[PDB]
Amino acid sequence: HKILHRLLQE
Amino acid sequence: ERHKILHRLLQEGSPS
């Protein structure tokens, strides 16, 4: 899940 | 809708 996983690791 | 048997159960119940 590109978006969700990305948004969470910042 | 109606729900005939539910009405009956509420009204009387169930035989033996």
Next chain:
Amino acid sequence: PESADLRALAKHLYDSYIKSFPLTKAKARAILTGKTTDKSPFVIYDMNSLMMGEDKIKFKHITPLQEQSKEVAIRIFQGCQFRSVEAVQEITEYAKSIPGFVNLDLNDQVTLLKYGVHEIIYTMLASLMNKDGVLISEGQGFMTREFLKSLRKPFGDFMEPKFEFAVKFNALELDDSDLAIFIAVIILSGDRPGLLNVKPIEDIQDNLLQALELQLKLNHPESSQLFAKLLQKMTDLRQIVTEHVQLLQVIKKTETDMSLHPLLQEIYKDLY
């Protein structure tokens, strides 16, 4: 309300509960744990054991519904349908004992039962289960979780959600006196679609809720947040029911001769 009133309510419900439901949890666990002398249940867990198990459509009194004739799956399906029909009648009677219920608009009485019935059936079904399987036929038998899971096509996915629910629910260790109040709380839900007069229903539920809360404090003094863990189960029941309804829709599509008992069609017509 005063504690005495809450205690009277809880005792009243317990009595009418014992009188509506023949098989209580206490009697069920006594059988599962094998601590009740009067013949132990036969374990049906696979094709060859079920064949030996004539406790469903044979040597006894031909009551259990279906007998191979059209597969083991249709069998079980009809068996639950029948168990479902007996519960509706029992639940219906039990509901008439809840103070204030018969005084509600008849239409609302019908609606509450229409939506509450299956949530209650699954609640009580948990009493007949354990991590490995479920009791069947007044306790006269025992079908394993593994076997029900192995049924063909979609039939094999019916019980698993129920077993998952039962394990977590049984972890709460509630007794029949607890369940009696919980069940009444489920019936008196003011959020059911189509209700005409919500307030009367909510007012009665508030008193049942307070009764339940007091019952749990007294009956389970060492279990923290039990009241909240139990009410949480009421939303889990929503998922089990809708998920179950969906599967009944798959069966309806993949099988021309679905055939459902009229009491269940009536209940299931335009549900949620």
Next chain:
Amino acid sequence: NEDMPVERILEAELAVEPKTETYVEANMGLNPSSPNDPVTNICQAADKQLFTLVEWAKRIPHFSELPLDDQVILLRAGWNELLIASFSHRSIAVKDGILLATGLHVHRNSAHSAGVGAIFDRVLTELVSKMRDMQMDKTELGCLRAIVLFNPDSKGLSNPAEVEALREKVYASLEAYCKHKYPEQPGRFAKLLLRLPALRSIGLKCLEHLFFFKLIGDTPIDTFLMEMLEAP
């Protein structure tokens, strides 16, 4: 602070509104796009609120301390109920209708016409009106949403009990909150928790619709909402 400080849950809720300004983008002056379909305008709001949802969860005590994969799971499993709970509570300020995060107001008849009445009416009667009648405040809403977020039954969790424990801490903080703020009403805590059964059934039915507005396409939806819709 106290495991589950109710002040921080309120701040999470407040930090990610609306709350003025955000109510004008497309309700009285302009409005990018131009979609002719209530379902479209709603799916756009959902998609937009999906980004703010991540930030909100990050402000919920202990969420960010869970493994990264556990957080993903929790959000994929609870996003629709979380989003439905937000706009339903926001819509207490309006009559027979819903207020989207995009500042757009969706009226009853439009939804009925679009073919999504019924599900829309359930939202209004089982969620919006119930919140209004008992007047649940933002702290309570925040706690209910946190309870939804912390679902120990989500498939794949590395430590289900750790999640259950967090959910129980919210149970404790919310109950304490009700007794301190609403001592006049002994049964408010339970009434708050009994708002969840309808949230779940309405959410499931909603997902059922989304999985139809997809397996038919015709002018697709937005990225992210579409990503969450790839099923859990």
